[PDB]
Structure 1
C-alpha cells in the first residue's frame, strides 16, 4: 500500500552536507521504484552507496547513479543491464522530480537525475518515479558545486543511503 521512502546522506569532498529523502511512486511505477529502492539499500550486493553525482547543471538537474564507471557511461539495474520504460504517467513538473536517465527507448539502468527546474521537454522520454520529500535545501547546496557543462568543482557523493520507515 504505502510508497517507500529512501535517503541519501550527501558529502562534499568527504565532508557531510546533509540528507535528502525521497518518496518513490511505487503505486504508479512499481518496477522503476523497486530498482531505485533496492539500489539504495544495496540488498542485491551492489547499488548507490559511495557513488557520485557526476553531472550537475545548475538550473537544470543533478545526475548520479553510475556505480560501475563513475562518469556517466555505466550502471546497471537489479533486472539486468537495462530495462524498459515502464510508463510516462508522471511528468517533470518542477524542482525535486526524480527521473531515470537513459540512452534511448527502453535503456534504463541505475542512473537517475533530480530536477532542479521544470524540464517538460523530457516528458514521455524519461520515466519519472519519485520526488524529493525532505532536504531540497541540501539539493540546492549540491547544485552550487555544478557548472554549465556539468563538471563539478568538488566531489559530490552518496556517503550513505538506505530506506526509511
Structure 2
C-alpha cells in the first residue's frame, strides 16, 4: 500500500540514473502524500526540473527547493508550511528520506537523503521514506558535493513520478 516514487537524476544535463523511494504513508500519511504529489506534479508544481543544491559527502544530499533553487524556497501542497507529523521513524542510516525545515512545524517541499546514520536529527526532522533502489546513484551524486555543501556539477531531477 505504501507508494513508490522515482527520481531520474542528471549531472550537468547528462543522465546518471534512477533512485526510487518507498514512502511510509502507513506511518506519516500527510508527509508522504506531500512528497508523492510533488513527485507526480499533479498539483501543477513539484520536483521535476529542480536541483540538489546542498550535498555534503558522508552526510546527506538535500533538494526540493523548486522555487528558488538554493535552499530559501519551496512550498508544500497544503497552501502553507505544515506541521511535524510525528517523529516515529528515526535517522538510522544511509537512504533515509527526511524533511528539511526551518524549525518546528515549518515543512514545505525541501527534503534530504541521508548517506550515513544521522541520529542527531531524530525529533527535529520528520523521516517519511527510504531509498528502495538506486542507492548507488545517490552515492554517485554525493561525490559532486563538497565540505560546505556547494556542488561542483549541476545535479537535477530530470524526471520524476510514481511507480507501480
Same fold (TM over 0.5): yes
TM-score (structure 1 length as normaliser): 0.99
Displacement of 1:62 after TM fit?
Answer: 0.1
Displacement of 1:81 after TM fit?
Answer: 2.6
**CA shift digits 1:78-116 (9 cap, x unpaired):** 002300000000000000000000000000000000000
Q: Tell me how far apart the structure 1 counterparts of residues 116 and 78 of structure 2 sit (CA, whole Å).
A: 30
Where 2:38 maps in the other structure, the secondary structure is helix
Q: Tell me how far apart the structure 2 counterparts of residues 115 and 48 of structure 1 sit (CA, whole Å).
A: 18
Compute the RMSD of aligned alpha carbons. Answer: 0.3
Aligned pairs, number: 164
Q: Tell me how far apart the structure 2 counterparts of residues 16 and 59 of structure 1 sit (CA, whole Å).
A: 23
**CA shift digits 1:9-28 (9 cap, x unpaired):** 00000000000000000000
- Which aligned runs of 4 or more in structure 1 are off by greater than 3 angstroms? none
Corresponding position of 1:64: 63
TM-score (structure 2 length as normaliser): 1.00
Where 2:22 maps in the other structure, the secondary structure is strand
Where 2:16 maps in the other structure, the secondary structure is strand
Q: Tell me how far apart the structure 2 counterparts of residues 109 and 102 of structure 1 sit (CA, whole Å).
A: 7
Q: Tell me how far apart the structure 1 counterparts of residues 22 and 84 of structure 2 sit (CA, whole Å).
A: 19
Q: Tell me how far apart the structure 2 counterparts of residues 115 and 74 of structure 1 sit (CA, whole Å).
A: 21
**CA shift digits 1:42-74 (9 cap, x unpaired):** 000000000000000000000000001000000
